[PDB]
Amino acid sequence: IEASYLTADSAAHYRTILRYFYHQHERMRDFIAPEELLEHMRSIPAFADFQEDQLHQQLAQLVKWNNLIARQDMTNAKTIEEYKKKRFRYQCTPYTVEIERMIVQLEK
Amino acid sequence: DLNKSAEEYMRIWEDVFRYFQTIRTSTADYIAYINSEQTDQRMQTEAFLV
Amino acid sequence: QTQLFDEKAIQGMDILFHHYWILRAEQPEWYQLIREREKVLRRYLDEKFGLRLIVHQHFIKLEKIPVEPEGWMGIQDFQEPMDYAIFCCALAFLEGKAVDEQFLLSELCQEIQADYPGDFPLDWTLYTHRKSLIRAVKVLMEFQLIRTIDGDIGRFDQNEEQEVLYEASTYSRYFMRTYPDDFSSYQHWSELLKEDWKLNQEDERRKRVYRKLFFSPGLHRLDQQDPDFLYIRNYRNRLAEDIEKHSEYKLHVYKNTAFLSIAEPRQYQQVFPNSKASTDIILQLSKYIHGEPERFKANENGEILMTEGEFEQVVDDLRQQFGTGWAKYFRDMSTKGIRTELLRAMKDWMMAEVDSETSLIRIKSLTGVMTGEYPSDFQTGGTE
């Protein structure tokens, strides 16, 4: 399934997203929610105009591939809508960590 | 008082600022960890223990 | 090395009295000040008053249990019993929420509606019910029992669909004191007092007198043989010396009343006279009563007895003389409305009573302590 993220119709976005997940895990800050990933997407010039909806489509697609561990964010909120939203937080699976480590090692 | 070769000085500077940039990256990452909203949401669970 | 009651202890005592409680997170200076002398404060309060001073990690609180409850004591932002009922129900709801748990205003409204114990259901389609809920929530927020995640409750007045996200703060646990038995076994609030004084049989009289003096604006002689007033009469000098030593106040004693005056009231204190216009008319009425001693000869207990008609006539006379200088609020209102407002004000200060049965008005001797008048140049100006 991982080959899909490596070479699917959004392989660039998938690679960037899992690379940010790997970055945050290597610093032990892995249980990330969509907002910081959206910020990272907007940081890169190519995806600078990113949107939350496309991010959610791709992330749901990924959790279908078990790239991530999904938790429901029922513990705290900052706005009324945020409270009403059944948000989620995501953590990368060990397999994802290892594959991204191999890709980074080839990069090195 | 500058009574030695230039290569020694370049090596000394290289070591100094390689290590200083190492420490600078370390402090940037560590302060990001401390400030992490991951921590701020992680207070509400056992994950805070982690 | 031993502690002594000093400027810091006096300041701490005043801060304890004039607030319900002091929170570390918001009043760190006051919390620190109170704690340092907390040993001396505990000793003094226990010996003389008998109040239990509760010192905790997050707050300091003085359980000011009154000798005889009086109207002004209660939470003033509330105006109807329903507000108190909704307040208590909201507290009951907060017992179900863990610290820093977040709940929406709709959930709180629903739970309050469900629990509300009256025969008549609580309904949110009304205006008055929503206003009552907003006042209850405002008082709750005043004590930091619940924090506000951004939103706006004031809109709830005119938009029942309004929504808000609230957070239960830790203080909710400690707000209400503890009660002697299984509290449910009691049937009327009066039974609570009979308990709280069952713990203070030792020198009940001294604690009684001190509580009445410090809490109430005044202490009225019940009859010719009132034991509290007899106690004060027997120990006037040492009472005055002790009170001067331990606080800013200075004692006064009369044939029919006793009270503590304050010379330099700080910002947070409440005192009479004050800005509210109704006091002006109270001072003018006091002067008018002074001016006709034979007509308003006080009975032996110091009360002056007048019927609603006689009081309204007096108020009309005042509106004739000094009405030109009254606030425009009263200048435009009929006599009976002024009578009602003035009597509410005088009730708050224990200046007078409305007789339950005969509707007779009793003006207490405390009113005659102070008299007020306009400057002579305006009064001559009023003549022009």
Angle at A55 between CA A49 and CA A60, to 5 degrees: 170
Q: Choose among B33, B44, B45: nearest Cβ to A29.
A: B33
Residue C60 corresponds to which tokens in the numbers above? Answer: 């300091």
How many Cβ atoms are within 10 Å of C329's Cβ, its own excluded?
12
How many Cβ atoms are within 10 Å of C41's Cβ, its own excluded?
22
Under DSSP, the state recorded for C305 is E
Taking one residue from A and the other from C, the number of pairs with CB-CB distance under 8 angstroms is 20
For the beta sheet containing C352-354, the strands, ordered from the edge strand earlier in sequence to the opposite edge, are C304-306, C361-363, C352-354
Q: Can you list the positions of beta strands (E) in C41-188?
A: 53-55, 59-62, 102-104, 146-149, 165-168
CA distance A10 to chain B (A): 27
Contact criterion met (CB below 8 Å) for C104 and C164: yes
Angle at C205 between CA C222 and CA C201, to 5 degrees: 130
As beta bridge partners, residue A72 has A88
Question: What whole-number distance in Å separates Cα of residue C296 and Cα of residue C301?
Answer: 13
Residue A85 corresponds to which tokens in the numbers above? Answer: 């939203």
The answer to whether the Cβ–Cβ distance between A76 and C102 falls below 8 Å is yes
- Whose CA is closest to A6, among A55, A67, A91? A67
CA distance A78 to chain C (A): 6
A2 lies within 8 A of chain B by CB: no
Contact criterion met (CB below 8 Å) for A11 and A81: no
The answer to whether the Cβ–Cβ distance between A75 and B47 falls below 8 Å is no
B3 lies within 8 A of chain A by CB: no
Residue type, A10: S
- Whose CA is closest to C75, among C134, C14, C139? C139
CA C297 vs CA C289, C330, C355: distances in Å: 9, 28, 19
- Cis peptide preceding C273, ω within 30 of 0: yes
Which residues of chain B are within 8 Å of residue A76 when distances are taken between CB atoms? 41, 44
Kindly give the residue spans of alpha helices, DSSP state H, lying in A8-67.
11-26, 34-43, 52-64
Question: What whole-number distance in Å separates Cα of residue C315 and Cα of residue C367?
Answer: 15
Question: What whole-number distance in Å separates Cα of residue A61 and Cα of residue C182?
Answer: 58
CA distance A86 to chain C (A): 14
Which residues of chain A are within 8 Å of residue C164 when distances are taken between CB atoms? 80
Contact criterion met (CB below 8 Å) for C221 and C301: yes
Question: What whole-number distance in Å separates Cα of residue C123 and Cα of residue C130?
Answer: 8
Which residues of chain A are within 8 Å of residue C163 when distances are taken between CB atoms? 80
The answer to whether the Cβ–Cβ distance between A80 and C163 falls below 8 Å is yes
Q: Which residue has the tokens 């006689």?
A: C310
Does an H or E element contain C152, and which?
none
B26 lies within 8 A of chain A by CB: no
CA distance A29 to chain B (A): 7
Question: What whole-number distance in Å separates Cα of residue C219 and Cα of residue C261?
Answer: 12
Residue A90 corresponds to which tokens in the numbers above? Answer: 């995501």
Residue C268 corresponds to which tokens in the numbers above? Answer: 């947070």
- Chain B residue nearest residue A76, CA to CA: B41
- Chain A residue nearest residue C150, CA to CA: A79
Phi, psi of C352 (to 5 degrees): -150, 165
Q: Label residue C175 exposed, middle or buried (CB < 10 Å: 0-12, 13-18, 19+).
A: middle
As beta bridge partners, residue A70 has A90
Experimental technique, in short, is: cryo-EM
CA distance A34 to chain B (A): 12
